[PDB]
Design a protein around this nucleic acid. Structure first.
Ligand code: K
Ligand code: MG
Ligand code: MG
Ligand code: MG
Ligand code: MG
Ligand code: MG
Ligand code: MG
Ligand code: MG
Ligand code: MG
Ligand code: MG
Ligand code: MG
Lengths: 173, 402, 65
RNA sequence: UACGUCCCUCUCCAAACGAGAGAACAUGCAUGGGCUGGCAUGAGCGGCAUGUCGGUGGGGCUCCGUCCCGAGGCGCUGAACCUUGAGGCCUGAAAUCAUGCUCAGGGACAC
RNA sequence: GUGAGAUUGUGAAGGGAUCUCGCAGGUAUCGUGAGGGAAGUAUGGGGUAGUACGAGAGGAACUCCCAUGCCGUGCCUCUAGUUUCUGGGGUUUGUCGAACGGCAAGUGCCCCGAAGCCAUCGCACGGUGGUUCUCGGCUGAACGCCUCUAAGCCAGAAGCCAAUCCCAAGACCAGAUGCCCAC
RNA sequence: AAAGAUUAUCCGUGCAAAGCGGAGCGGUGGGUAGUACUUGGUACGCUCAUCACC
RNA sequence: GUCGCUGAUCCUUCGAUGUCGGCUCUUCCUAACCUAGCGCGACGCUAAGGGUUGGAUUGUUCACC
RNA sequence: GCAAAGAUCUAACGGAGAUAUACUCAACAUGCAACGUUGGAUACUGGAGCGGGGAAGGAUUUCGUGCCAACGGCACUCGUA
């Protein structure tokens, strides 16, 4: 329901009733799997491999993955990230004379969705990297440094030259 | 003037109009005739299509040049998790057709069943069936259930159960839907009282496919074909292309009618929708009803091929993934793409011919990769061909320094 | 059925895969040759020697071990 | 009034545009790892540096030997690169998937 | 009665009369099936059997099996076709001092090439009953003989009707059911 | 489509004859121990806990 | 013998109804060629449900191989 | 319908041409689209040239500063207006 209809405090209460009640308890009640498994003939009917949260490199049965992630205060205005963008899957079978301009638009949209900005400014180094093999020869991957700033928010996006793209993940710097 | 030369018309006029189907699921338009002598039983089940493959078998057919010889046959794999029964309905005959008498609901329902009544379930109040749930257990609700069951006993002639799928048990990542599919399944056999007793016994419980179908019988399939959007006359109806030098285009019907009647008739071919139509397909033989991999890992091992392997090919079913529940293997093809839900039905046609009565024994089931030209049946076979590779050498030299 | 080896590469050919070919100048002991891939058949037509193609069993056996 | 529905946003079994199937803090999305497959042995070095063994070249320069020019060849090397995108698989059989981002979703009707 | 308006042609404020419509449904599933459409059709072989019939020569047929032609509805495991995944490799002329990386020749050109699409060039499937015509009969008179007919019954065609199959409530379904509001 | 002080108790029965019948035990959350089901998610025995109908 | 089911006219159109044949595509008729049943090797009755081809020469329709 | 002559991208500066909001609301989901100049990048013409000069024909279209009503079949802060 709408947060301008209900007070902010009222909106908090509805979220709490679902979060700690009828979701958290179900978890604590279904804990009873330990009680059943300890009584179950050892080996014997042990064909219960997955149940009970006793298995290598598996998920937490009973709760979602999103409900376990750590929540933190909203990030500050000024923040810097480093990321890889896979442009090859975005530009597949596109008309050859439009590949570099479309790459510019796609990069802007990617960063804009990530950073909640409408004003995304492309640095000269990134523009040169995207165009440096002609209009049809756009590289398959690119690594970008994204800096958000406030005057109204906007981003500056620039190129990070790398030797190989293997093993790199999104980082906050 | 009569046409100089004659040929049969293009297309079947009994499949008109070629419009999009009203729903995406396959629904049986009729059920096999009820024979009151038999024991009460269910007549359909819902399954999900996951790719196809091929098998080898010996043929038992006197008089055929293929007698006692090995043949290769393509098959389709359909995943079949158990269904859950949530309600009972009854119908009475009238001079204008069948009418629903009432519905008996189960005392508890699943969240997946209740999700089917909303468009945004997560951001809602989630109050479906709450009043019915609390009212059905008081003194008056019990009386009302007794009343409606007696009305079924007195006036009904057809009994059906309401059943739904279990997507949480399906555990597939490309089937995005989370609200259950719901359908009526008719109960055939016995008398009305016996039907009611069976339907009341299996209320709030789940039903497996192997309790509806047996291995070597046949079935009918109800499903919706793949869509292709707006299609031209050459593909939609199979008319001939015109010569190269034709002005204004070649992929057309040249004459769409005579001077009289001064009209275009419903029998002439025109451009329009092709695909996404409902179809009922007749005699599909069941080759295997397979147990869940968690229960029995050697799904695709036969008596003649002792290799241990599952029904999932190397690299997975393209666009679908792993098969993790019970499954059925049908001979041949079925309408519709991968991931679509379809209905299996008990057969209508006579099942007395030799081909329908034959007993099937599999000798080889293919599990090579469907990406590319697969040439290995197992990962162990691939690892026997290639020895250790550079990646393995690095792994075994950096996992030993510790 | 039985698994057959490809004429050019000795890849294993399982039931329901591949293509079989019979030449006019047929050998009495091998009238029919089995090919696992169009690439293998094309190389055999071009008359290459399998011992120089690095992904064949012949090459692997004479070089790697 | 309330239950709710639609738009914006995300996905593709649908699709000219409408319409459809779905999701709505969800392994949802992103990047990486592993698989599955494609091609056919990368750039650089050196023939003495590769896996107790095995180590070029028709010819030609220079001051005996030694040091150089040279297409191609051999070793490191089934290497290197590519692999979901109009939209392949694995985080739930076994023996093997990891991180990062979401921080009161917004608007219109229902009235 | 209860709310909202307007009363529409010469200024700015006040209060009277009439007019108009708002005063109960909304949203989400499962079904029925009137009416309309409508489809399967040919050829060969086996054995029946060298049997019946025949002086001999010669020489059948139904139940039931096995295939194939055409037509129809789908499908993509395999085989085949297709590549702007410009995927990997190779190769010509020009060009950034060279190598590396590439780039221009509206996709330079050659080989192999996944996914998708697709072929009587591949693979799967194609149902049951009622009546009644030509005709064959039964009981039976007129016309006590007779007669398949005048009454009345029985068998019977790739015909017609229904079902299975496709669309389906302007066919306005007090068919069933989940939730909220109104009474 | 249902049948009744003019449609103003409930089942049973044939628009009968008779026969019943009218704190409790429901929806929710807390402990507590076993079971069933495809095995993470629902039911079920006790036990308080707030709302309930009658 | 008997009894039935190309021409000739000039009514419409000269402030214009595009003139042969083939190709493509649908539909209807029976005066039945095949397929289906009967009665008498041929002849007759019912039956329009399904089908009725590839080529050489000729602009040909026809005709002929 | 405005589809032959392959094609633009990026930052800063300029301009009324914006970052233009009622409650509530950190920012996305409520001001879009488009322009001149300079720098950088990427391509095209390819000496029978969208190079540099003349005849016929035209007659101020030439140069600078302003301006943007009409005209430059979209646009303009620009123009053979
Ligand atoms: K237009
Ligand atoms: Mg599609
Ligand atoms: Mg022409
Ligand atoms: Mg494949
Ligand atoms: Mg009908
Ligand atoms: Mg150039
Ligand atoms: Mg190029
Ligand atoms: Mg245009
Ligand atoms: Mg153009
Ligand atoms: Mg040029
Ligand atoms: Mg203009």
């Amino acid at each position: 329901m709408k947060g301008k209809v209900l007070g902010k405090e009222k909106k908090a209460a509805i979220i709490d009733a679902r979060k700690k009640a009828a979701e958290s308890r179900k978890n604590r009640d279904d804990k009873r799997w330990k009680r059943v498994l300890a009584n179950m003939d050892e080996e014997k009917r042990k064909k219960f491999h997955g149940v009970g949260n006793t298995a290598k490199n598996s998920r937490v049965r009973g709760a979602t993955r999103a409900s376990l992630l750590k929540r933190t205060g909203r990030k500050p205005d000024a923040v810097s990230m480093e990321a890889t963008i896979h442009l090859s899957k975005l530009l597949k079978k596109k008309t050859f004379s439009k590949r570099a301009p479309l790459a510019i638009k796609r990069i802007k949209a990617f960063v804009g969705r990530l950073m909640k900005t409408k004003d995304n400014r492309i640095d000269a180094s990134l523009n040169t990297y995207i165009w440096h093999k002609g209009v049809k020869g756009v590289p398959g991957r690119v690594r970008v440094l994204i800096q958000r700033k406030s005057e109204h928010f906007y981003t500056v996006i620039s190129n990070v030259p790398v030797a190989s793209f293997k093993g790199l993940t999104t980082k906050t710097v | 003037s009569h046409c100089k030369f004659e040929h049969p018309r293009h297309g079947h006029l009994g499949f008109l109009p070629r419009k999009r189907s009203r729903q995406i699921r396959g629904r049986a338009r009729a059920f096999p005739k009820d024979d009151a002598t038999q024991k009460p039983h269910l007549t359909s089940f819902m399954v999900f299509k996951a790719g196809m493959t091929h098998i080898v078998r010996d043929v038992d057919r006197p008089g055929s040049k293929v007698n006692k010889k090995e043949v290769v046959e393509p098959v389709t794999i359909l995943e079949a998790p158990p269904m859950v029964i949530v309600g009972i309905v009854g119908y009475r005959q009238t001079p204008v057709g069948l009418k629903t008498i009432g519905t008996v609901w189960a005392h508890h329902t699943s969240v997946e069943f209740r999700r089917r009544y909303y468009k945004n379930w997560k951001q809602s109040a989630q109050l479906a069936f709450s009043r019915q749930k609390q009212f059905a257990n008081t003194k008056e609700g019990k009386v009302a259930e007794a009343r409606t069951l007696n009305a079924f006993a007195k006036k009904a002639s057809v009994i059906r159960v309401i059943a739904h799928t279990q997507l949480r048990k399906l555990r597939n990542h490309r089937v995005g839907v989370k609200k259950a599919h719901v359908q009526e399944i008719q109960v055939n056999g016995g008398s009305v009282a016996a039907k009611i007793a069976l339907a009341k016994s299996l209320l709030e419980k789940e039903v497996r496919v192997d309790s509806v179908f047996q291995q070597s019988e046949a079935c009918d399939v109800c499903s919706v074909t793949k869509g292709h959007g707006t299609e031209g006359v050459v593909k939609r109806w199979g008319v001939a292309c015109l010569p190269r030098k034709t002005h204004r285009g070649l992929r057309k019907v040249a004459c769409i009618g005579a001077w009289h009647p001064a009209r275009v008739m419903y029998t002439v071919a025109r451009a329009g929708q092709h695909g996404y139509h409902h179809r009922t397909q007749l005699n599909k033989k069941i080759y295997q009803i397979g147990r869940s991999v968690a229960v029995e890992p050697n799904q695709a091992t036969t008596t003649y091929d002792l290799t241990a392997k599952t029904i999932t090919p190397m690299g997975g079913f393209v666009g679908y993934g792993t098969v993790r529940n019970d499954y059925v293997m049908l001979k041949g093809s079925v309408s519709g793409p991968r991931r679509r839900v379809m209905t299996l039905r008990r057969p209508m046609a006579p099942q007395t011919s030799r081909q329908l009565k034959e007993k099937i024994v599999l000798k080889f089931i293919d599990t090579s990769s469907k990406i590319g030209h697969g040439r290995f049946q197992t990962k162990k076979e691939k690892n026997q061909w290639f020895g250790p590779l550079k990646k393995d050498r690095i792994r075994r030299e950096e996992r030993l320094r510790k | 059925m039985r698994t057959i080896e490809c004429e050019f590469s000795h890849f294993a050919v399982h039931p329901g895969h591949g293509r079989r070919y019979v030449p006019f100048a047929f050998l009495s002991t091998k009238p029919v040759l089995t090919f696992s891939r169009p690439k293998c058949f094309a190389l055999y037509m071009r008359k290459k020697n399998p011992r120089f193609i690095p992904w064949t069993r012949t090459y692997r056996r004479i070089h790697r071990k």
